[PDB]
Symmetry: C3
Subunit: 252 residues, 3 copies
């Protein structure tokens, strides 16, 4: 059985970490296959949105430390844990059941949107074992929830419940336990109904803009806006609306 | 006149005045907005601006040279130096949301709504909504709103810390004036320096931030208002500022 | 009678501003003794976490204006108001009773975590007196709570209650009035149970990462992670977890 399963439903790619006996921990096989799945997602013109999930009712207990200690290529150059260091250009949704701990919280945080079972949990317990979270949890956590609560979780290693992460605005949608994938699919479909060149460019600006100075950010944004103004989709969106009918996207 | 301007002691009230087009921005509006922000920043007897729209709507979005270079849609690309409060009624969608975000403080009717629907129509929000929404509410909720194009209610924007004040429908301007009055009561230079530091510090490195700040602090130490504030407090009486 | 009390309780350094008379405001003696205590915290191998508090029902009323006016060296070069310009490497917790105003709010913000009494208050009223908060409150407050609320508070000068600062995510823990210090100690102890090199690097990464670009952040982080991989504590964490017993940390 593949250590990561990949399935297309319409224009959504569903990516499932499949080591439920190892609590979906990330070895080199998972890390390469996540990497390849994101490549696939970005390259395939028939796809609009990715969804990341774990098999068997749990998202991911983190990095496979045994595999790392033995020497597998778990943290891939320019990619990290699967894609922690190079997320995909297209929208990516985490669908979380059970535990998303350590590297697993890091994978969730590397996505754009999180849908989490009401009974699921996150955390970076690394320090409790004399480790440090190095898959970007320490870079992204303080950017998703209040700085001091991120600090607190990082230094204590305490769990952060899905409901608390939703209250703090880290988790976008709370689902019925067992129903996270379905809710993430519903969310993915809303995004998929939108203009794909506009969606991608919109994600890029949100993401990159934190690195842009006050003085330069409008000009940097404009370089990304520039192909939108003359895109076929931009003209279609206006035509359809004025024709009072649904839009038809081509990604051009 | 497609934009009204009034002075109320140290407050400037700037009213988009085209309710027929749901207060959408044309070149007259845009140029007059920019004109009013410059007026706000020039007069040392003004401390705070308020931006509102006439007749139960704030601004519907973009309506012809509407986007003044170096300034944007009225002021989206160079907001004023001084504090600016949006007073929101009805729909503030698309470019109207961007106008609201370009202000510092948002006072909104409890029945008003925000949103950046641009992607639904194969467009991208270019007036700063994508730059500012993620600064104002949690990053992932901003991402969600941007990619889906869904509305964000005034009550939810208030819960997320983007709307400073919920007001009764029809009363957003009055609440905005009360908020402005709480600010015009404070030292004019110290208020202005306070906004400047908060704004610019976003872009200062940890190793330079205090020295960068000290440059702004410097004339406050010797300002007449600093002495007046000290004199007024011991004397247990209200301060009489001069903006020097 | 000394103006800053410093007490060790096991691995916790407790630092008490001791000028209840002057509402624990910072003159040059308090300022230098705060810096000395932060130096002691970082230098002492038997120390893991600091707690900053104020004697007598109040945290700190801010800079001592009478001291500043008579020309005392209150704002120490390279340190600021005690440590506002140079916080310590080890974790630091503010334990807040009564008022933490003006420079007092800025002291609390220069810590990593805030434990506040349910009836305590924060704020930066400077502008009401024609002054400007120069101890970092204008730098840090918009990093702790929603940006436009930070903006609002700085311009109006309004108090922010402990309950509101907690709802906003600035205060980590609400304590019983009069028992802020004990709740800070319990929080310190959770952090003290964790691996000291790992905790120190964790705080470091969270703090510094705010200034690293997207395309350099993982490499800058790696520089800090590097000695964690081969530290004796990472090994001790594994062995202690293997043997199902408390880890015995060495800081190596």
């Amino acid at each position: 059985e593949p250590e990561v399963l990949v399935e297309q439903r319409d224009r959504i790619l569903i990516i499932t970490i499949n080591r439920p006996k190892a609590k979906n921990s990330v070895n080199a096989a998972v890390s390469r296959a996540l990497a390849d799945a994101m490549d696939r997602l970005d390259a395939d013109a028939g796809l609009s949105v990715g969804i990341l999930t774990g098999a068997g009712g749990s998202f991911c207990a983190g990095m496979d430390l045994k595999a790392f200690a033995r020497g597998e290529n778990v943290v891939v150059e320019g990619r990290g844990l699967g894609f922690t260091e190079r997320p995909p250009a297209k929208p990516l949704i985490a669908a979380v059941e059970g535990y998303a701990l350590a590297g697993g919280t890091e994978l969730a945080l590397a996505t754009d949107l999180i849908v989490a079972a009401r009974d699921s949990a996150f955390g970076i317990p690394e320090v409790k074992r004399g480790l440090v979270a190095g898959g970007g949890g320490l870079l992204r956590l303080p950017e998703r929830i209040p700085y001091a609560i991120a600090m607190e979780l990082a230094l204590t290693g305490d769990n952060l419940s899905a409901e608390r992460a939703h209250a703090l605005g880290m988790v976008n949608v709370l689902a019925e336990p067992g129903a996270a994938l379905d809710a993430a699919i519903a969310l993915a479909e809303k995004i998929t109904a939108n203009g794909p060149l506009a969606v991608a460019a919109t994600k890029r600006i949100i993401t990159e803009s934190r690195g842009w100075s006050l003085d330069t950010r409008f000009a940097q944004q404009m370089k990304i806006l520039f192909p939108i103004f003359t895109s076929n989709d931009a003209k279609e969106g206006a035509i359809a609306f004025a024709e009072k009918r649904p839009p038809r996207w081509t990604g051009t």
